[PDB]
Amino acid sequence: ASASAFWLEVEGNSMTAPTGSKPSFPDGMLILVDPEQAVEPGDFCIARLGGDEFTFKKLIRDSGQVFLQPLNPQYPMIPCNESCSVVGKVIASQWPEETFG
Amino acid sequence: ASASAFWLEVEGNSMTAPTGSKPSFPDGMLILVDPEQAVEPGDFCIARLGGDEFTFKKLIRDSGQVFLQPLNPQYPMIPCNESCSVVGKVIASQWPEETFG
Amino acid sequence: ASASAFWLEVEGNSMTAPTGSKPSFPDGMLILVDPEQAVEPGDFCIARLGGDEFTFKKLIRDSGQVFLQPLNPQYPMIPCNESCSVVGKVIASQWPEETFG
Amino acid sequence: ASASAFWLEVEGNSMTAPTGSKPSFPDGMLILVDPEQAVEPGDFCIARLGGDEFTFKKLIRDSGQVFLQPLNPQYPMIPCNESCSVVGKVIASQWPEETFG
């Protein structure tokens, strides 16, 4: 983790995998984002979309095209082209301490 | 966390909560178990059953009895009676680093 | 594979995992069943239920109880007690040759 | 299968068909690719794209053009034009033995 890494809290159910699937990042978990670490296909990342909004997804590539893939099958895949940029690689994830008291 | 605390890998879907529920510990996650920390009602824990096997559940009380409750409604709750002992309180949970490449 | 092993064809969608999950055994695949190989928790198997009907599921154990678990979240888990018996361990699975012509 | 044929692991959900469809090649499956067997329309294959990267798709023809079609409707079809070459026909597919413990 570089000096640029920062923690974010997962929002929504787009990265919550179906029961029996892994990994899975339910709403409420914390994820560590590191801007200084490259994101390769298969890695989890934070990406910046058209409206400059941040999104937490898995970066994948198929037939030469890059997409932002959610772990929740009910959510759509997002083409990652010119208007999209990678903010950082997700390198860690844990439940906050408070979860256990 | 005491020096006796140890990490364990979650196996199975018994502690995977319904999408949207908080918290959830899907198969593959790691949990930190501290034998030296008391387990109060509502706390998560590891329990030792009569078959020298273990179970990761939430400890609850009902009708003057102790029960081990799964976060997944499809799994049955078990009475933590005589032949069942608390191993330790779960005090942390995170995805193993290998999860992120 | 012992001399007792035999092939079966997967029927139905109960062992078809959600998109993005693995393993998965869609209707139409072939599975190799070996009666002479023990089935341990976590293994795939063929079990014989009350009406003596065969079922292909994952054998699991939680809190001391055995269950037959389907990979398809929409299907129910089945308690595996006295009336249920393990026929054989599933040791291989492939698409039939005809699938590719 | 010729001596040039080789096994490859399926990566991604692009060839995972909708539940109930036949066939389907979910992430984690192995496919046997034979460079010495011609790929006819309707056959599955491996293709080499302009980015020295590969793609596992079904080869189809349309409007006098060749296309690589994914079994998962959420992934886009790609024209197999000039800069795209067929590597070999997929002639077999199975789960790796490690899948069964």
UniProtKB/Swiss-Prot annotation, chains A, B, C, D:
**Protein known as:** Repressor protein cI
| UniProt subunit comment | Homooctamer. The DNA loop is maintained by octamers of repressor cI.
What does the record give as the function of this protein?
Answer: Acts as a transcriptional repressor that allows virus to establish and maintain latency. Prevents both the viral DNA replication and the exit programs. Clamps the two operator OL (operator left made of OL1, OL2 and OL3 sites) and OR (operator right made of OR1, OR2 and OR3 sites) together by binding to them and arranging the intervening DNA in a loop. This step allows repression of lytic pR and pL promoters by binding to OL1, OL2, OR1 and OR2 simultaneously.
What part of the entire protein does this chain span?
137 to 237 of 237
Give the residues annotated as coiled coil: none
Q: Which miscellaneous remark does the UniProt record hold?
A: Bacterial cells harboring a lysogenic lambda phage are immune to further infection by lambda. The cI repressor protein inhibits the lytic development of any additional infecting phage particles. The region of the genome that codes for the cI repressor protein is known as the immunity region.
